[PDB]
């Protein structure tokens, strides 16, 4: 059964991938090799080219991503050879290092061994490789509430944060065979952080806000041709709204808008004064300014929307069907000022793709 | 066939309406009367109570409306007795007058005779009873582009606008029997307009912006118990975003953001400066301030979202199933600062309701 489902998904993928690669004649003698290897071993092993392209095809089919224009420039690191947790850790250290690239962020993905027969070889617990801790205990709310569950889990394993609002969580992953995950504190030298300042409001630094340079998502399942790479951390760069309008703005996150309104000198008393809307703008201007000022990659929601329109045009030009999630594609500030708002998208799921998976903690 | 569809819809409605009215025992001797009247006449006639409540039930089931909290305070004017176009016109004049209420807007709906056997008795061409004209001719873009089609149609019938950016369109409707619609110029005394000013930027008046006080939608089909009131203009008050973020902001409408950015003293050169977002806020602050300053009803998107949450709570409290359109319920500015963004809604269509219908023009 599980041998059949793999064969069907692989037939669809290899045909399409080789179709796009210009190896349409190589499809047949490859499917045979797979047809045998599947029957004999239970699974098949991707070539370096299929996997590189499969990871690019998966980003392209991410209905919720606004930055899909550059799907083909994705730097794919093939780490299916890792066996030890010192290799996993070093590869994760290297990913941070090479994806960061001194501030000029390279969209990168590191691919670890996939599930054999549903069995994970490596199991990453981090949502993102770089992420702040969160603490909730008796009136105490410190750090990122979104990180509360993982933080408690890490503290169950011997780790202790300094309990600042910006404690770097450790890397925490579990190898096949071991009962508990291991954890490694992140070298500070490898992590770029950006202090949030404002172009013309010098009082803005009094908020002492900051965020990390590179968002490296590490808890999603890359699925390529019936093969489940449950451990494949990828990254791009930030769209400013993710930080300025959600991470630092949400009440169930950092909840900084009243503080922003105070330092930008406006009152937070009346809804009719639109202080939340005004604070959201100056904070988001601050995030973009701070990242540019340091030399770290970032895009604003308008430029990103322009780029995504090109992706729509590129897709149409290629005879490729477009898929997208409107509810996720629209930016959380001024969405009506983007073309995304004024058209619809087909939220159908095409593989290869990236999927959510259950947390090993909680 | 058309006799059956009416009977099914009526059975569902009468049962439910009387259920809510506390006349659950009166359901049976009423359905009989309908069962006969349908068989003998092809249709049935609503009582003054069912229609009043049916129009309130229809507003409640509008998945896209954020102001549904006050569905029960809807003022229903029963004008199913109109036979002449001087009665239709006067009723429309009266609707404007009583709904406006010197600035303290009453949510009102005027109900005209419904379709007999698919045949319209009255056919209103106006999108809204009060709306500005739009002109596009050889580089000329004057007024509201959204009104271009209707405006041209009105000018085909002897009407001529002064070709300002804010020409009041005439009322234009067609009576059963007549080939062409008639038109009547609106008495200026009945129309409240609001000049857009800014609380602290005196240069804002240089834009010479204004909008009308009351949005009275007149091209939607009210459906109550298999009965199609194709002519039932209704109104509430404006949520500020409709004017400040869409009507006056969209490029395919009034397209005023660069002009707003100029008068509020910021540059419109870089996306990273978030000038569209900043202009959208000050313009929207201007709209709310201008309406309050004059004494015309208006609500901001935050207060409206708070009210809609109460509607959600009121519905849950009543054992009533909630339906809603997330893509339309979220406001076009700072939507993530509202609870609407962070939950989902069932976009199922429940009757009674309001529906789009084909334009007699274009
Ligand atoms: C190049 C820079 C990129 C930008 C600016 C970008 C932008 C975004 C944004 C803003 C989101 C919404 C996230 C949220 O609201 O929480 C998103 C979602 C997503 N992006 Fe991208 N993205 C980029 C690169 C990538 C890359 C390299 C991949 C993977 C190969 C990817 C795959 C996805 C996926 C899977 C989601 C959905 C995540 C979810 O379900 O929460 N994107 N993208
Ligand atoms: C009390 C004040 C009201 C407010 C503030 C309000 C707010 C809104 C808003 C903002 C929209 C979205 C319109 C758009 O984006 O174009 C909307 C849609 C709608 N509202 Fe309301 N509304 C109110 C009263 C009413 C009333 C009295 C009715 C009818 C009885 C109604 C029925 C609807 C319907 C049918 C739509 C959907 C129209 C469409 O499909 O374009 N609302 N409402
Ligand atoms: N710039 C980018 C690129 C890719 C991204 C991929 C994923 C995400 C976030 N997805 C998970 C959101 C769910 C969540 C998790 C924790 C706290 N709140 C919400 C962002 C990306 N950004
Ligand atoms: N405050 C309110 C209350 C009720 C409303 C009902 C309808 C509308 C607008 N619906 C039609 C939008 C489609 C359109 C038409 C012309 C130009 N652009 C878009 C607003 C309401 N507002
Ligand atoms: C209910 C809704 O799907 C949910 O709140 C979504 C809305 N759209 C979103 N869009 C983005 N980019 N990110 C999000 O977290 C969400 N949340
Ligand atoms: C494609 C999408 O449905 C369309 O652009 C909608 C989005 N949500 C909206 N929401 C409101 N309130 N008004 C609108 O006109 C629209 N337009
Ligand atoms: Cl993030
Ligand atoms: Cl309107």
mmCIF file of C-alpha atoms and ligand atoms in Angstrom, chain A residues 127-128 131 146 215 217 220 234 236-239 242 253 328 356, ligand 3:
data_model
loop_
_atom_site.group_PDB
_atom_site.id
_atom_site.type_symbol
_atom_site.label_atom_id
_atom_site.label_comp_id
_atom_site.label_asym_id
_atom_site.label_seq_id
_atom_site.Cartn_x
_atom_site.Cartn_y
_atom_site.Cartn_z
ATOM 1 C CA UNK A 127 10.102 26.505 14.808
ATOM 2 C CA UNK A 128 12.909 28.721 13.565
ATOM 3 C CA UNK A 131 13.977 32.593 17.771
ATOM 4 C CA UNK A 146 4.612 32.121 20.799
ATOM 5 C CA UNK A 215 13.958 33.726 9.613
ATOM 6 C CA UNK A 217 11.815 27.861 9.342
ATOM 7 C CA UNK A 220 7.838 22.092 8.120
ATOM 8 C CA UNK A 234 14.688 26.762 4.739
ATOM 9 C CA UNK A 236 14.377 33.674 2.733
ATOM 10 C CA UNK A 237 14.402 37.238 3.975
ATOM 11 C CA UNK A 238 11.809 39.105 6.026
ATOM 12 C CA UNK A 239 8.931 41.103 4.659
ATOM 13 C CA UNK A 242 6.030 40.099 9.634
ATOM 14 C CA UNK A 253 2.918 38.512 20.925
ATOM 15 C CA UNK A 328 -2.348 34.841 3.646
ATOM 16 C CA UNK A 356 2.844 21.753 8.733
HETATM 17 N N1 LIG C 3 9.987 35.745 5.047
HETATM 18 C C1 LIG C 3 9.447 34.433 5.322
HETATM 19 C C2 LIG C 3 9.765 33.335 4.487
HETATM 20 C C3 LIG C 3 9.227 32.088 4.779
HETATM 21 C C4 LIG C 3 8.360 31.947 5.939
HETATM 22 C C5 LIG C 3 7.797 30.653 6.255
HETATM 23 C C6 LIG C 3 6.947 30.511 7.394
HETATM 24 C C7 LIG C 3 6.652 31.626 8.213
HETATM 25 C C8 LIG C 3 5.759 31.470 9.403
HETATM 26 N N2 LIG C 3 4.936 30.299 9.234
HETATM 27 C C9 LIG C 3 4.451 29.852 10.510
HETATM 28 C C10 LIG C 3 3.432 30.843 11.071
HETATM 29 C C11 LIG C 3 2.666 30.248 12.293
HETATM 30 C C12 LIG C 3 3.165 30.922 13.651
HETATM 31 C C13 LIG C 3 4.227 30.384 14.340
HETATM 32 C C14 LIG C 3 4.653 30.993 15.523
HETATM 33 C C15 LIG C 3 4.007 32.119 15.968
HETATM 34 N N3 LIG C 3 2.976 32.627 15.275
HETATM 35 C C16 LIG C 3 2.547 32.057 14.135
HETATM 36 C C17 LIG C 3 7.197 32.882 7.910
HETATM 37 C C18 LIG C 3 8.078 33.033 6.729
HETATM 38 N N4 LIG C 3 8.626 34.268 6.409
#
